[PDB]
Every structure is written in structure tokens, then in C-alpha cells.
Amino acid sequence: GDWHCDTKWMGDHVITKSTRTWVLPTYGNHLYGPINFDGTTGSGANAAYAGYKTPWGYFDFNRFHCHFSPRDWQRLINNHTGIRPKGLKIKVFNVQVKEVTTQDSTKTIANNLTSTVQIFADENYDLPYVLGSATQGTFPPFPNDVFMLPQYAYCTLQGNSGKFVDRSAFYCLEYFPSQMLRTGNNFEFQFKFEEVPFHSGWAQSQSLDRLMNPLLDQYLIGDYGTDASGNLIYHRAGPNDLNEFYKNWAPAPYECIQNINSSDNTKNANSINGSNSTNKWGLQGRQAWDAPGFVQASTYEGAAAGQSLLNGVLTFDKSSATTSSPAATAVNRTIEDEIQGTNNFGNARNNIVAINQQTKGTNPTTGSTSQFETMPGMVWSNRDIYLQGPIWAKIPNTDGHFHPSPRMGGFGLKHPPPMILIKNTPVPADPPTTFNPMPQTSFITEYSTGQVTVEMLWEVQKESSKRWNPEVQFTSNFGTSDPAVDGIPFGINNLGTYVESRPIGTRYISKHL
Amino acid sequence: GDWHCDTKWMGDHVITKSTRTWVLPTYGNHLYGPINFDGTTGSGANAAYAGYKTPWGYFDFNRFHCHFSPRDWQRLINNHTGIRPKGLKIKVFNVQVKEVTTQDSTKTIANNLTSTVQIFADENYDLPYVLGSATQGTFPPFPNDVFMLPQYAYCTLQGNSGKFVDRSAFYCLEYFPSQMLRTGNNFEFQFKFEEVPFHSGWAQSQSLDRLMNPLLDQYLIGDYGTDASGNLIYHRAGPNDLNEFYKNWAPAPYECIQNINSSDNTKNANSINGSNSTNKWGLQGRQAWDAPGFVQASTYEGAAAGQSLLNGVLTFDKSSATTSSPAATAVNRTIEDEIQGTNNFGNARNNIVAINQQTKGTNPTTGSTSQFETMPGMVWSNRDIYLQGPIWAKIPNTDGHFHPSPRMGGFGLKHPPPMILIKNTPVPADPPTTFNPMPQTSFITEYSTGQVTVEMLWEVQKESSKRWNPEVQFTSNFGTSDPAVDGIPFGINNLGTYVESRPIGTRYISKHL
Amino acid sequence: GDWHCDTKWMGDHVITKSTRTWVLPTYGNHLYGPINFDGTTGSGANAAYAGYKTPWGYFDFNRFHCHFSPRDWQRLINNHTGIRPKGLKIKVFNVQVKEVTTQDSTKTIANNLTSTVQIFADENYDLPYVLGSATQGTFPPFPNDVFMLPQYAYCTLQGNSGKFVDRSAFYCLEYFPSQMLRTGNNFEFQFKFEEVPFHSGWAQSQSLDRLMNPLLDQYLIGDYGTDASGNLIYHRAGPNDLNEFYKNWAPAPYECIQNINSSDNTKNANSINGSNSTNKWGLQGRQAWDAPGFVQASTYEGAAAGQSLLNGVLTFDKSSATTSSPAATAVNRTIEDEIQGTNNFGNARNNIVAINQQTKGTNPTTGSTSQFETMPGMVWSNRDIYLQGPIWAKIPNTDGHFHPSPRMGGFGLKHPPPMILIKNTPVPADPPTTFNPMPQTSFITEYSTGQVTVEMLWEVQKESSKRWNPEVQFTSNFGTSDPAVDGIPFGINNLGTYVESRPIGTRYISKHL
């Protein structure tokens, strides 16, 4: 094989090729094993799980910035209002297995030419599909970087205390037809996406509450109150009060999501516990974070600087890190203000309904609602996709689903790209000279390495807007920085690591609502 | 592949094949990095730069003596008045990668058969083109010598103190389609030069100020002065004064370039600072040496022996050296006296113009000019090409350029030969047995080696001159020397190194101007 | 006819249609007349002129913002590195002539259906071509605006005191074949531009003084000085001093242009006279402003904020004005920093040449040059084109010209778009009832109006850059403003006038030099 990394922009299509180097350790000493956690220690009963670890490992390209560069992403988002995937091609090649030997004085590495690796793509979705969970192990952003393939594992149904039950499944992965790859062999796979709507690559320049001609007034008459005697009063909505207008549509549904302020210290209460104040959804006796939830506006236009939602936004690392508690300077915190036309700001309880029934004695009373769900006549927008975020998710296999668009972002797929698994074939050490029936537990220490190339085909929308004035676009505003410490933003720094300086998203072009 | 080195002289064409052995180290520990220098120390603010180092490396054949031998160069310059390039072919083959292992007791080297190297030619001129800067790393003069490929790096725009700015670019070189070469694979590349005028391979046997018939006198009348009363006087130019002649043409433009004397000690001022007395051109707040400048005659015919210009000539090493301050006996200092017909001697301020306006009271006054630039009706000659000098340069991509002939010498090309880059593919060491998301920073120590052959096609002019007397030609005038210390000049010396004894150039044949 | 205004973006082409309403007064009472100014009063002798006024009037579309909108210009300059014109179509139609009558009590306007207007395009360039002088009368930026056609006039050769001479020409414009247009008639004209190079739509990300590999050092030896005894010293340029490098190319030529600071008050001398400190070029006994001159960098990267050149930049009005001395808040002052790679900052006298000839007694001396003109081996860039600036100029008809690119900006054309002239046909009042031989000086007061549409065809370059990091682009950065006083920037304000908020230009994309 050869190294193919390039991008080609056709009129409505763009092709992205990228190729990378990987390394595969032997996981688990060639052994499966059960794993669980019960609720006796640590987080608690809500953290319990049960499942299996597997000697196999797998490839994950599911993030965007695997397939694009900050220049190719800019070229996409300033000129195009939509994108969707078409097909992909995967090729792993130049596989070479290496044996490791240690005398405790030094470690020797040799090249074993007859060893193989096993690889198969799961076509029929027989194994539990772990790709859409936004975990680590994805290809690096920067092509010169070498990455390590993650170990495959899954969770099954659990009883109390994180124990197996009857419905719990155990999957043997050697019961699948696979291909063995020596040096000189390659593995290729074709895939074609199902028809999916374009993602919306535009911000919106109007609002639902103002769709009208502001000079006019309605031919519909409203109810302005009652008289002092109890007689109904009428009123016509007009340009002096436009909130009075009747309207055909309503904004998005919501659950109230607590607000947090990232920039301003003085806007936040002291010592709040983010575990207690997060939205939860419970299932099966325990309850998990509902996050990010259904997308609400993080902030609206006139607003305090730094306003956000608590666990209502996506947050990324500037560079890959294990920190587990990163500092605020190491993160890219997204802002979704572009949906503020159809999507209300979370933690704003504006909606108001009637809580009683009037009569002569009783005055009508109303109240504000913390949770207001979907009813006919509502319109909303999906969460934006980011250069650092997931491309797709797998829609669960179930009897019903409502607007099956992933809550993290991207494209819900009924048949997503299949999960490609790989392991090192075991090579046993010298057996005894008399026959033993027991399984052979002694093996030769080895690992694999090679290249993998991913070629993706995309479908874009170019538009014609007749607005006169210019539009906001994504530009590089940094003043200088310092080649001696931090390099070019979106480039290699002094220590050699690649840094993604700020989060980027697809909505820079306005379109009237 | 096979070893092809030969030269074939056809009538108007000559083909030069040469092949060499190279070695490629791993540069930068597989890491990019930012580089800068500010003006706080060392040379000063004029020395500041900013850019990136790359793990890649590249081939440079841009000097002539890569493609020719002192005998083939002599055969060219005595019989031919012009040369230009036509096409070239590049082939790198017999690539073999080697692993290095050290116990601190000894260093072991082994041959890894499955490792690869990556190579690509930059066709579209996407990367900054560093070849035309006359830096080191070129193929050796002598074919039996083994050379090392230089590391690739570039400069971007800089702010003050050598810092990056918005316009500063970062180029990832793994974003290019490349070819992987094991043992048994080769990389070939074809290139064809654009149409370019022949270089002038002749000295000139006349002068601009004498183009005339010396026996005759003009039908044009001159202005010989005014009378004692103020009446205009006329004069006819004739064989007694030939400087009086009117003329259709004028010599080359110039900037005054200070003179230095290489041979004679007693002609030079004591302790001059070559940094202060060099011509500069400033750009972007700082100023760089203007060197060599636009070519002026280093010396003219009747002149002091050893006369030259300060930073107005090219100077070479007799053999490749790192000295950084070589002795005068280790250098080949060129002399351009062959343009003395159309090109005036630098540091001669001869040109004279009128500095006032006469009338009855005011006598006319004139002055000599230090800088006299291009005006209609001028003719000049380009700098000569040398066996040790650069073949081509890349004309910058810009809206305008005037006479785009390189100032060092050779052929300005809008599409020069592309820059061929190569690196060793990284082979990682054994990973841990549990998954880590961080990039893998431990690799196996290795290097590459192989052969590269370059085949160039040239176009020459043979002439017929009707002069009677013989012409000067390039001959070997050395008396004897000493096989015990210095071998044959233009040959291997006692220590084994190859020495180029004196500088050679293409103008030995006279032609009337 | 119909109203056609739209823009269509094809792959390499873009078509711009725009149509406007005009009004044509009767100029000069149907009379030609001589005009002059002598140097006795006012500005002085340098302001003298002589020529003729004409009853005719003409169309001028020569500015860019006639053909583009701020959104279509943004779409051009962020995605494209070059533009050139191809052809144009002009159509004037819906012509209606109106008679005016006054009783001194009121003014009556009536519609005369049989009156005509005369129109012709000057194909052969027989009349003096006044279009390329950047004067007023151009189509408005905003299509709903109604504009007035300017009166045609020209200058001829003059003697002293602004008087006619023998060579002075008088042109009768009724000696040309023209077309008469009633209501229901239209005038159409086709034109096709000559082949012209693309304008450079990119900023440049490198510099001439750094084109090299910064890690390496040269095989060319320099001259570092002389010894204390007078012996020549040598030095090798290397990464510690990169200004020492020999180089094939040199930056732009210049004339020194005085600097002015627009933003900072404290950087400017008090009460300078811009007429005395401007560069001049004299011709024919008098001297005119040389402005802007040949383009130099207004400012370079690390620099004081507000730095500019005095009469070295273009300056525009935010909205069309007669002010004649506009305030600094009413103007758009351009900045050209994008050429700072090949073009030195004006009013920086960096260049240094040798002013003497050394010997034992005399030390070498140098000096800085105020004016350094074109010599072989220089590269520069042309002035940028702006949304508010001229599209083309007419190259004078002359025996020689050097780099005939207009100094204001745009495309020098040997055959530019011809000049289209129009007048109202005279309608005489009632003659006497006895014959008089004298010319008839009494006419009916009238004016014309109609629509004109201009359809232009353009040729654009789209590029592929392999830089990784993103590029700067043109965006709308204004925070809010105030619908009650100033509307959307690049939109109608409260009083109804159209305002162009800031100057825009075509170089936002970096490309290595």
C-alpha cells in the first residue's frame, strides 16, 4: 500500500483521504474476563455495571477532525449550508508483527515474518455496538501522530449489585469468520450510508415571535380582559404590541436545565455540586445523567458574557489528555447561540399556563412551567456539529423513537458504519514433551503495527442568499503568539504536541427563518 | 536498479547520467517543531526569523558539478557558446532500512526487510520552495562519495521579535499523497523544462563605446561649448576623439559596489567591516545584504592585479567544508571580466549628469552619480554560470518582475524542478498492555540508505566564427604537484578527499559585440 | 425593457446584472464653450488648463461597487485568488422626455412623446477619453438610487497662462453617427475585453529576505571584512545570521514617500503642508502631484498603529458627498500591508550603496538612498483593487511604457470600454414670421430620464492551498449599532442614505511567496 491523504473539492461533493499509523498490544493475556462494579463503594449504586473484556481491539474514526483539517473545515463552513455523508472506504495494510524478548538486562525486539493478525468487520451488527458513546480511542487529529487501538468490551443486563442474570449474553468473537493478514496482505472494506437529511449549516436571522409585517395589524381580534361588570373586552393586535399577535407556530419543547457561567466568577453560587444539580433520567431502579439533553440555547443575544448551561453544552480538550479533571484553560467549551430563534434559553422558565378555573369569586391565576414538552405546532433545531465532535450514532433497535437525532450531535443511522475488530493471533511457547490436556497458557510476547487509511465521501449544499450586507465568518483573530513556547494556533507547539485552539462549528451563515 | 553514470555528446544535445549513494537519518524524533530567532542577541534584529522544522528530508542536485565532470565541462565551454536544460529523470532505488540497537557495550545494526520509506514530489508547488537559496546538502561533486540528505524546514511571515502572526502558515506534510518503498521498489519522476533562452557562453571582443568605423567621422554635429560672448560653438566628432561620437546605446545600470582586493594586501584599507560596507536592501522594517547584486565587472582589462568587488562576486570552496571562516587558500574566488564590454566596473562612479541650470551668471555644473538605474536604450549581460554554481532558481509568484534572471546565476524558472521529499516511516516500540489515549512517543531507532540516479538532457550551441587568430581556452597549466601530498588537481588528494582546484566558467570564446 | 439585476456564480465565471435610473439635463444651453484657468489666482500656475465644455453627457460605471454588493464581494474575496473581466453589455431603454413650463406661480411638467435623445458609443477612441481619471458621476452603489449624468468636457494642449495653441484640437460631437431614441426605442452595445492577467487576490505569507532553509548554511562564501594588515577575510552565512545570505532576487523599486499617521495624533508634526511635502512630477514647465505613486507598503507587521503614507494610499467616502474637505469619520482610508513581502515600506530609506572608493588611507563609506529605481532582478506587487475603486484605465497611446499597470488600481487596457455619450435633441421655440439668417437661440426647456442596465462577465480563480491552519477572512465584526440613527452597516441609515462602512479589498488569502 501507499500513503493517501488528500482532500478534493468537487462542486457538490468533497472527498477526504487520510492515513495513519497504529499499534496493537495483546490485551488480557489472550483471555476473556468478566467485569463488574457494584454500588458498595465509590460513586454508588448508580454506577454499577456488568460485562466482559475481550482480547480483541478495534478502530474508531467517528470524530470529524479525523477527516478534516482546520483549513478544510473553514472552507466548508463559510461557503456551505449543509453536509451529509455518502460512503467510506477503509484499508489497513503494511501489517508487521514484532516479538519482544527480555533478559532483564535489556529488551530485544525482533520482526516475526510468519505471524498473522485477525480482522473482521461486523456486518450484521451481531456484537454490541460501542462506537456511538463518544469515548476515547479515536484517530488523532494530526496525521503524523501514532495511536493505539482500544480494547473491546461491553455491558450486558445486570441484576442488583451489578450481577449477571438470565438475559445476560456472552459473545465469543472467534466464532466469526475473519481474515488473517501477514506482511503483504491488506484488508479493505466498502460502506455506503443510507439516505439522511443534510445537517443545517446556517444560523437563523429571524425569530418565531416576529415573523410578521411590523407595519400592519391583524384581522384577528383578541381578548383584552373583562369589564368591571364582567363583560368581555376585545383588542386588535398591532405594531405597538407585537407580542399580542396570534401565531401559527410555537418554539421548541424543553426541560429546564440549570445555568452555569463559565467566564464570570461572580455570577455563580459558591460550591454547587454538579452531580446534584444535573438533570437525571432514571431507568431500571437507578438514574443516569441526562446530558446534554435536548438542545436549548446556551445564551441569547443581549445577555451576560459567559452565560451557559450546566451540562447543557459540549466541551472538548484542546489536545488529547488523560487529566480527568482538566483546567478551564485546557478545554474548548462550545456555545450554541445560533438556534436562539426557534430554541428558548434553558433555565428560562417563560412558558405560562392557567392553573385554575375562573368564576365570579375566583380570579384567574397562572403559573410558570419548569418542563414543557412536545405538542403539535412546534418547531426546533438540532444541535450543531463541531470539528471535534462525533459524526454519527446508532439508533437503538426498538419499536418506537421520536425524532431520532442524536443528542450529542451528528447523524442518527439505522445501519451505521460497522465496527472493525482486530487481534494478534496467539503464538504459544514451547510445550512440554509429554501430552497435557490442559489449555496452554504460555505465549510469546508480541505486538502489531501498520497503517490504516480512511476515505470518506461527502455531500454539500451551496446556497445563494440575496441579503445585501456581508455575513459573519470564521477567521483567525489571534494576534501573534510565540514560536518559542506556543506555535501557530491549530499547529504544533514547542513540545511537539498538536493543539486545537478553539471550538469550531458549522453555523456561520444567516438565513431568514 | 543498476548504476548508470555516463555522458553522451550528440550534435546539439548532451545527456548526463550520474548516480550516487545517500543516507537518511530520522530527524526531530518524528516531531515537527517551531523555530525562531529574535533580535535580542547575536547578529541583531535583522537576523530574526520564524518557521517550522520537519521530520522529512529532501534531495538537492541543483549545482552543475553534480551533472558534469571537469573534462566534460571543458569539452562544453571550449566548443560551445550556449547551453540550456531540456528535461530530467530522477530514480531512487535499492532502498534498505536498518535498525540500530545499543547495549552501551556495543552498537548493533540489523536489516529490517519490512520497513518502508515515504517519498513524494511536490508537483503543484504547495510547500515553500527552498531549493534556490544556494545552501548545502547538494549531491557531491565526485560520484564515489556518500552524502546525507538535509532536513526540510521553512520560514513564514514574522512579527516583531520573530513571532508568528495570522498570515503565518503551518504545513502538514503527511497530508500529501506519497509512495511507500520497501526493498525491491523504486521511485521514478519525469520533468520537462519550460522554454528558456540559451545562456551566453562567449566573452565579448568589442565595447559599446567603440562600435564605429574609426577612420570616419560623423555627419552629426555636436555642441563644443559657448563663445566668449555666449554664442554656441559646434564640433564634428572624428577619429581624433571617438568619445565625442553620438551613440544609439548605453551600458548597464548599476548600484555602486565597494571594491576589495583579494591578491594585493597594500590596496585595501585596514580593518574594514564587511557588514557595514556591504550594499543592503531593506524590507519590512529590517534590511538584508544585497548580494551579489546586479552583475558588474569585477575588473577591467588594464587594471591592478587582484582587483574585485566586495560581495560582488561568487566564492566557492575547493572541497566541501564546514569551516564557516575559511582561509583564502581554501576558496575559489570567481572573476567576471568577460562582460567588461557592456558592463561597467562596480565602484567606478563614471556617469555624470547636470546638477543645475545655466544662465548668464551661473556656470553649468555636473556631478558623478553613485547609483544610476535602468532607462531606455541600455544593454547589459547576465552573470556567468560556473561549474560549482547553481543551475536554476524559482521566479517568485508576483504581479511584476523585471528581467527575471537570477542574480547568483543560472535559469529563472516559473515552474522549476519540483522538490522531492522523503522520510523514514516510524516504527513504534512495544506499547503497554492497557489502552492509553496519549500519542505513542517511543520508537525504534533506524535509518535508510539507497541510490539515486539523475539523468539530465541539455541543449547546446555550436558556432562558426570567422576570426583568423586563435582564441583563449581553458587548459590545465599546473606544473607538477606531488602524489605524496596533493594528487592530480581536480582529483583525489592523499587523504582521499576530492578537491576542485580553481573556478571554471562558460565564457572563453570571443564574439564581436 | 425589463429590470434585470442579479448575480450568477458559475464555477470559474460570475455574471453581474444591475440596472439603474438616470436623469439628463440640458447642459450649456445647447452651446459649446471654451474654458480655461490661468495661474494668476487661486492655486497657481500649476493649476492652469484649457479646453471645451460640451452639451453632451455620458455614462460612467467604472467603479466595482456598481457591479457588486458587499455580500457578493465577500463571496468573491474569501473563496477566490483572482479576477479579470471578460465582456460587458449595456442597454439604455424606457427613455422619456419631459417639458418644463413656468408661470413664476408654479412649475408645470409635461410628457413630450415625439421628442428624442441622441446616443452613440465612441468605438474608435476619437474623442479624448476621460473615464480613467477617477472623477465623480459614476453609478451609485445602491440600486434604488437615482443619479445624474455628468457633462462631457476635455483639456487640450495649452501655452503659457492657459491659452490655446496650434496643436489644440476642437471636436464637434454632432459629426458622429448617432442613434435617436424615442419612447419604445432602446440602445444596446456589446463589448469584449482583451486578454489580461488575473489580479492577485492573495496576501503573501513569506518574505524575500527569508526564502531559504533556515537550518542550513550556504556553499557560497562571503566577504567579512579585511584584516588589521589589509588581508581579505571570509565568512560563511548560516542560521545564526540569515541576512548575510546571498540571494537571487531583490524587492520593489521605490521613491521615498513621506509618512503620515491617521490614528495617532502624537506621531505627526504640527501643521505640515501636504502640498509642499507631497511627491511631485513635473512636465511642460509645471509640476503635478505624483499620487499615489508606485505602490509601497503603507505599514508592515510590527509597527505603530495608524501608520500610513502621505498621499500614498487610496481614500474613499463612506457615502457620496460634495464636502470637498471631509472629516476623518466620513472617509474610508485603505491599508495595504499585504504586499509587505515584496514591497518595502515607503518613507523607509533602508537601501545602502557605496559612495566612495577605498584604498590604504580612505576607509569605505556608504549612504542611504532616498530614491532607488528599477534594476534587473527585482520583483514587486501591484496595488490592490477595492470594492469602491476603479476597475480599469486606458493605457496612453505612446511609443513606450513600462509595466503598464494603473497606479490607482485595476486593469490597464489598450482598448478599454468605449465612452457612451448622450444629449437631448434641441426643440426650438416659435420663430419669427419673417426670415432671419441668424442661428436660433430660443429653445424649449426639457430633460430626459430612463433606465440603463449593465451586464458584466468575470473570470475567477479558485485555488487549493495545503496549509493546515485556517486563514483570515472578511467578516462583519460590528457589535450592535442603532436602528434609530444608523441602520445595518452596509445598509440604509435612518435618513435614507446608503453608507459603505469600511473599505474592502481582495487580498485575504495567504500564499507562500
UniProtKB/TrEMBL annotation, chains A, B, C:
<dbReference type="GO" id="GO:0039615">
    <property type="term" value="C:T=1 icosahedral viral capsid"/>
</dbReference>
<feature type="domain" description="Coat protein VP1/VP2 Parvovirus">
    <location>
        <begin position="1"/>
        <end position="477"/>
    </location>
</feature>
<keyword id="KW-1140">T=1 icosahedral capsid protein</keyword>
<comment type="similarity">
    <text>Belongs to the parvoviridae capsid protein family.</text>
</comment>
<keyword id="KW-0167">Capsid protein</keyword>
<dbReference type="GO" id="GO:0005198">
    <property type="term" value="F:structural molecule activity"/>
</dbReference>
<protein>
    <submittedName>
        <fullName>Capsid protein</fullName>
    </submittedName>
</protein>
<keyword id="KW-0946">Virion</keyword>
